């Protein structure tokens with residue numbers, strides 16, 4: 001993985017003279033100096049260095065870009081803050097654990113045509129790593145194992161494989177704060193809704209749900225997991 005300054009040099013093409021149009025990262029004119037210049041320090045990147053992104057052609061202070069990148073885990077990918085194009089292979093802060101998958105013949109509410117896939121995520125507590133909020137300090141993992149259900153049809157089996165890619169790229173979980181329990185520095189769901197109940201009366205996260213499959217299949221396209 002290249003260095004943070006080099007990551008921004010890739011997937012970027014410097015602008016000769018920046019327009020009057022604003023940089024949406026620092027809310028300052030691209031013509032002027034980055035608004036994060038006072039707290040961000042590069043080697044090869046100035047404060048009036050500006051390029052637009054390779055494919056999506058959105059322009060920012062390359063220092064802002066760098067300021068952004070650096071606030072996250074530094075996997076060598078970069079996400080356009082305007083249109084969210086992924087540059088490289090986005091990955092994420094998911095702690096070590098296991099993903100088991102099972103199938104059973106019983107159908108789910110709304111999918112009586114087919115069988116059911118059981119996904120079991122088991123993730124132990126540990127010590128936060130460099131990518132996590134407070135490196136070195138412990139993190140908790142609440143509620144594991146967490147059982148998840150997919151209709152065993154064509155889409156459901158597709159989403160299954162896409163979720164195996166998500167796991168590989170440490171995308172399904174993250175260390176952070178729980179919206180449910182308010183507890184901090186802990187393993188929580190990250191951006192990819194999972195059905196944890198067959199019967200949606202129990203918790204609110206179950207079946208039937210017509211559009212779940214369509215929702216998640218785009219919820220992980222938003223993290224760069226596609227065909």
Ligand SMILES: Nc1ncnc2c1ncn2[C@@H]1O[C@H](COP(=O)(O)OP(=O)(O)OC[C@H]2O[C@@H](O)[C@H](O)[C@@H]2O)[C@@H](O)[C@H]1O
Nearest residue numbers: 142143146177178179180181187188189191194196203205
């Ligand atoms: N029970 C749930 N099942 C699936 N997704 C859930 C659940 N509760 C919340 N979510 C989704 O998880 C995301 C973040 O919610 P958090 O509460 O921060 O995540 P987490 O604390 O892991 O979720 C609560 C989890 O803890 C367990 O005690 C509980 O049974 C559930 O699986 C949001 O997308 C939210 O909609």
Ligand SMILES: [Zn+2]
Nearest residue numbers: 023026061064
């Ligand atoms: Zn800026």
Ligand SMILES: [Zn+2]
Nearest residue numbers: 056058080083
């Ligand atoms: Zn863009």
